[PDB]
Design an enzyme around this catalytic site. Structure first.
Site, PDB file in Angstrom:
ATOM      1  N   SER A 197       0.842  -1.197   0.000  1.00  0.00           N
ATOM      2  CA  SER A 197       0.000   0.000   0.000  1.00  0.00           C
ATOM      3  C   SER A 197       0.884   1.258   0.000  1.00  0.00           C
ATOM      4  O   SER A 197       1.652   1.466  -0.936  1.00  0.00           O
ATOM      5  CB  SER A 197      -0.922  -0.009   1.225  1.00  0.00           C
ATOM      6  OG  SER A 197      -2.011   0.879   1.034  1.00  0.00           O
ATOM      7  N   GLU A 324      -9.105  -5.099  -3.949  1.00  0.00           N
ATOM      8  CA  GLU A 324      -8.414  -3.958  -3.361  1.00  0.00           C
ATOM      9  C   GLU A 324      -9.308  -2.862  -2.767  1.00  0.00           C
ATOM     10  O   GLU A 324      -8.892  -2.157  -1.849  1.00  0.00           O
ATOM     11  CB  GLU A 324      -7.501  -3.326  -4.413  1.00  0.00           C
ATOM     12  CG  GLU A 324      -6.337  -4.191  -4.854  1.00  0.00           C
ATOM     13  CD  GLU A 324      -5.270  -4.297  -3.790  1.00  0.00           C
ATOM     14  OE1 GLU A 324      -4.179  -4.822  -4.089  1.00  0.00           O
ATOM     15  OE2 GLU A 324      -5.528  -3.856  -2.651  1.00  0.00           O
ATOM     16  N   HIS A 437      -7.465  -5.915   0.714  1.00  0.00           N
ATOM     17  CA  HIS A 437      -6.267  -5.110   0.640  1.00  0.00           C
ATOM     18  C   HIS A 437      -5.388  -5.472   1.841  1.00  0.00           C
ATOM     19  O   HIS A 437      -5.848  -5.439   2.981  1.00  0.00           O
ATOM     20  CB  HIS A 437      -6.674  -3.637   0.708  1.00  0.00           C
ATOM     21  CG  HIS A 437      -5.542  -2.675   0.527  1.00  0.00           C
ATOM     22  ND1 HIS A 437      -4.807  -2.599  -0.637  1.00  0.00           N
ATOM     23  CD2 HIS A 437      -5.047  -1.715   1.346  1.00  0.00           C
ATOM     24  CE1 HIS A 437      -3.911  -1.634  -0.529  1.00  0.00           C
ATOM     25  NE2 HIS A 437      -4.036  -1.082   0.665  1.00  0.00           N
TER      26      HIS A 437
HETATM   27  C1  NWA Z   1      -2.358   1.601   2.222  1.00  0.00           C
HETATM   28  C2  NWA Z   1      -3.330   2.728   1.864  1.00  0.00           C
HETATM   29  O1  NWA Z   1      -1.278   2.408   2.710  1.00  0.00           O
HETATM   30  C3  NWA Z   1      -3.443   0.867   3.015  1.00  0.00           C
HETATM   31  C4  NWA Z   1      -2.819   0.235   4.260  1.00  0.00           C
HETATM   32  C5  NWA Z   1      -3.611  -1.017   4.661  1.00  0.00           C
HETATM   33  N1  NWA Z   1      -3.151  -1.877   5.769  1.00  0.00           N
HETATM   34  C6  NWA Z   1      -3.930  -3.121   5.674  1.00  0.00           C
HETATM   35  C7  NWA Z   1      -1.735  -2.287   5.714  1.00  0.00           C
HETATM   36  C8  NWA Z   1      -3.389  -1.270   7.089  1.00  0.00           C
END
Ligand code: NWA
Ligand code: NAG
Ligand code: NAG
Ligand code: NAG
Ligand code: NAG
Ligand code: NWA
Ligand code: CHH
Ligand code: CHH
Lengths: 532, 532
Positions: A197, A324, A437
């Site tokens: 992410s 996602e 995600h």
């Molecule tokens: C990404 C937007 O940086 C989402 C992060 C999601 N987790 C599952 C790692 C918290």
């Protein structure tokens, strides 16, 4: 002693850790920068001053100040991502899992946590690198960096709050690994950074930033890319949000100097309580303080850099998960719930579309709606739900990543693309969310090898296969075993554009990952909003 | 004598015609208007002055002056549509096929030929109504009307060339049938007008025009609708084309009076030789002289009339063919040929798209291309070919017709929709053209009942089933037999929107005919071009 290591900053005392009926060394909480506290808040990180004596690296460090998700108190699915250790602005530390006996010059992998740049911790259970370090014989390192306003408040022009300081924290850590990893048996010349992410976006940003390129060898990006619509903002937008944050705390806004001084006198939680009040639109998958296109860390626009090949040219391995967008719809879109099937009415679909593409005018919204609606059965609540899931996922993760991979592969030295679509048998989230995600991480870190976590045999096999792909790639620039008898993960090329599915079934090769929808998001829609 | 009939305009002497080892009466070439010749060119039609003596109605009349397709000399597929009798401005006649013995008050069906308003003949072999008249016991009438500049040159404001005179010719014929059909055994109160393509558009235009509504009972529209993008032009566009036509013939353009006088001194073929030079764009499925939205024949815009219900409210039966666009691509799009499979390259696809949506800007063209391109296999020449076929067909026939049916059904008294998708076993055109525009006509007129034409048994069965649907509908307003044991053609409703396939297999009911693509052409694209 094997748990004692002398570095250029001083000596550190590790701790022996049991892993799969065995043991390895762990050096937790090693400082790599001066505590960014006091007048240093919002400032660039300063290298940690060398210390006398032995540094106790036997326990996890604090986690950086961040918003804490309390949407489902007691629920493990959400709390496994929350900080599991005391929060503090003094949080610039890194962790190292070293094989036993200590190697001499083995492959190094550095983990960069995600969390939308507003949250994240290097100490989470799902990030424990003892399984990967042990199983693949690599030196696993996990860094940390300031998130939220603390790491990304941006008042371009000012030197007290220039923005991107959170990215610089990451770089400072990479610099430390470059200078000291050798003393832990790691090879500074074979360091692979990887993250998910925002951590994936971070990885890409270091590939782009001239000042970070020389600090690593290869890169792995999981469900994140530098060009993600949520990963960065302009100098103007960053400033507007900083001022708005000051406005929320009753700050003097006569000058950056006055504004910054005020924000610095506020307690951590004070800035965090009003953090979400600065967003420009009603939207999902949008975060307040993120990297800024400043003309420094990023020389020019990300798109012009990708077009011109202004980036580190090496090998990369990256991919996305099937669903996602489900995560963020649950938290903000109307009609979605954790305990229901979340079948979406047409009204909620429309509301959801507007929340997903905030920067879109009416025509744009119509374009999206048409692109994802089955007009032969438009009231089907499941199709509407899954339709929104695809929109959020395609727009925020998949299509941006596909644009990045196609642009990089043009100048790069080797690309390997994957599509992770296996839903954990023990997932605690509802079924409608699918392959969520961030749920490929537990397989990347080898959690399925711990019988007590209740995974299936096949899942343990996938985890080992994934861990070996990642580790073999970090070590050689190719995830495949030289002269192996197993299925070969083909190289992604501009011509063929091949990728593989990552699940429990026998490998399958495909081409043009989500090409139809991504032509819409990467080529058509942008042109439409710009013409109108 | 059975072949002798006295009408309000005078007496006519028919001729006994053999049909399927039997016989019926035929009255060919009955005049219904004064020969629109000389200073009457471009003028509204005048009723035919009553005549003394007996009018010889034993042979087909002349065909109106029109462009003749010589694209494939000797080829039957194209020449079957060309005029099969001498051309002449003196062409305002109608034909009647009367059952023997002469009925007293049976159902009447009036045929309006198509041909893009630039061509057409009531005397074509495929329009011979003896089979339908004989088989269904109906009085079959086929009218004629001026086409090309002769019937549609429009200089709104002028009374010497007001435009729409070709539509008025049709009305004059309908008026004659209303006043005299009774003498041939027909019921003036049960007259159904039906036509294909421009003839289908014509039918719809009479449903809309206040001055035509009272001249018929029901309507059947085959692959044509009043709102088709090619069926009409504005007062301004009509004028521009008339002036341009004058410019092509070296005419004085100082005034309508001078312009009209010049055009009237030119020989027929002179106007026809430069007819195609007046089109505003490089395009296919666009004709020079067509009906004009004048504020008279058409009170207001067709769309506002449909919205407000300003039209004749009765029952209608209509439909389309599977491959409506193949015909015009063959004649004008690059890459298409009569003797090849016409596999289209991406370059020719793009060229074809621009020819199909002439009024479209870049964004619009991109919208269309995206909507019809499979980005996982965009070089597939067959997909490109068939893709263009759908674009031309959806844009010019299907979607316009679907908009019309959905709008009419709102105020109408009964709708019956069909989707004709059977390809004649003896079709002489290439296979890539599929179920071609206008090839449902031969089944409507019962040609498959003539063994010598080499149709299959199943096809003869479909023809009889179609002829009976059309005839039963004209007679009752419902194509189905009251208490029948055969499959029931369901009524099309705003809610269910049902339709049936018309082929040789057992009936199948579907819903939302081409809804996905038509939402694009009827709702999205129009909005896009207008916003940009
Ligand atoms: C990404 C937007 O940086 C989402 C992060 C999601 N987790 C599952 C790692 C918290
Ligand atoms: C990577 O670079 C090496 C040496 O620069 C070259 O030989 C090889 O062909 C490249 N491979 C790819 C996938 O571009
Ligand atoms: C048609 O009109 C008749 C009488 O006006 C009415 O009884 C009937 O319900 C209508 N049918 C349809 C299909 O609208
Ligand atoms: C490190 O400090 C001592 C060793 O110096 C050790 O006993 C202790 O457990 C470690 N830190 C903690 C948990 O207090
Ligand atoms: C009609 O005219 C006569 C009858 O008056 C008939 O013999 C002739 O065949 C018909 N017209 C033609 C073909 O000349
Ligand atoms: C319609 C445009 O008027 C096309 C006419 C086609 N034929 C097949 C009847 C000539
Ligand atoms: C993605 C997120 O968890 C957003 C959390 C929701 N708020 C913005 C309301 C705190
Ligand atoms: C549809 C048509 O047959 C058009 C015929 C082609 N010209 C315009 C060139 C005469």
């Amino acid at each position: 002693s094997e748990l004692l290591v002398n570095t250029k900053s001083g000596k550190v005392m590790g701790t022996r850790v049991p892993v799969l009926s065995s043991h390895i060394s762990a050096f937790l909480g090693i400082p790599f920068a001066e505590p960014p506290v006091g007048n240093m808040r919002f400032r660039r990180p300063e290298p940690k001053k060398p210390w006398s004596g032995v540094w106790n690296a036997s326990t996890y460090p604090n986690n950086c100040q961040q918003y804490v998700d309390e949407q489902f108190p007691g629920f493990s699915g959400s709390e496994m991502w929350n900080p599991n250790r005391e929060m503090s602005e003094d949080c610039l530390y890194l962790n190292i899992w070293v094989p036993s006996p200590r190697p001499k010059s083995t492959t190094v992998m550095v983990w960069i946590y995600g969390g939308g740049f507003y949250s994240g911790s290097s100490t989470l259970d799902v990030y424990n690198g003892k399984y990967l370090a042990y199983t693949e014989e690599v030196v696993l390192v996990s860094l940390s960096y300031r998130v939220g306003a603390f790491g990304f408040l941006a008042l371009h022009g000012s030197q007290e709050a220039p923005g991107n300081v959170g990215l610089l924290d990451q770089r400072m850590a990479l610099q430390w690994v470059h200078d000291n990893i050798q003393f832990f048996g790691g090879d500074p010349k074979t360091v692979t950074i990887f993250g998910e992410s925002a951590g994936g976006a971070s990885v890409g940003m270091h590939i782009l930033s001239p000042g970070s390129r020389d600090l690593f060898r290869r890169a792995i990006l999981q469900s994140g890319s530098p060009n993600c619509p949520w990963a960065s903002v302009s100098v103007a937008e960053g400033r507007r949000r900083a001022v708005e944050l000051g406005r929320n705390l009753n700050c003097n806004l006569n000058s950056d100097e006055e504004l910054i001084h005020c924000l610095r006198e506020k307690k951590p939680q004070e800035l965090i309580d009003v953090e979400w009040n600065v967003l420009p639109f009603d939207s999902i998958f949008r975060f307040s303080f993120v990297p800024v296109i400043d003309g420094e860390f990023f020389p020019t626009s990300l798109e012009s850099m990708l077009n011109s090949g202004n980036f580190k040219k090496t090998q990369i391995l990256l991919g996305v998960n099937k669903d996602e967008g489900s995560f963020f719809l649950l938290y903000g879109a109307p009609g979605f719930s954790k305990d229901s099937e979340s079948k979406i009415s047409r009204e909620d679909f429309m509301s959801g579309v507007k929340l997903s593409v905030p920067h879109a005018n009416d025509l744009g919204l119509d374009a999206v709606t048409l692109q994802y609606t089955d007009w032969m059965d438009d009231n089907n609540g499941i199709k509407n739900r899954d339709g929104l899931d695809d929109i959020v996922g395609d727009h925020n993760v998949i299509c941006p990543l596909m644009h990045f991979v196609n642009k990089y592969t043009k100048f790069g030295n080797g690309t390997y693309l994957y599509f992770f679509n296996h839903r954990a048998s023990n997932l605690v989230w509802p079924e409608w969310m699918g392959v969520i995600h961030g749920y490929e991480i537990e397989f990347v870190f080898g959690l399925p090898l711990v019988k007590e976590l209740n995974y299936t045999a096949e899942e343990e096999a996938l985890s080992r296969r994934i861990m070996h792909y990642w580790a073999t790639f970090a070590k050689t620039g190719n995830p495949n075993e030289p002269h192996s008898q197993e299925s070969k993960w083909p190289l992604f090329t501009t011509k063929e554009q091949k990728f593989i599915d990552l699940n429990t079934e026998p490998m399958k090769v495909h081409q043009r990952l989500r090409v139809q929808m991504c032509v819409f998001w990467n080529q058509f829609l942008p042109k439409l909003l710009n013409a109108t």
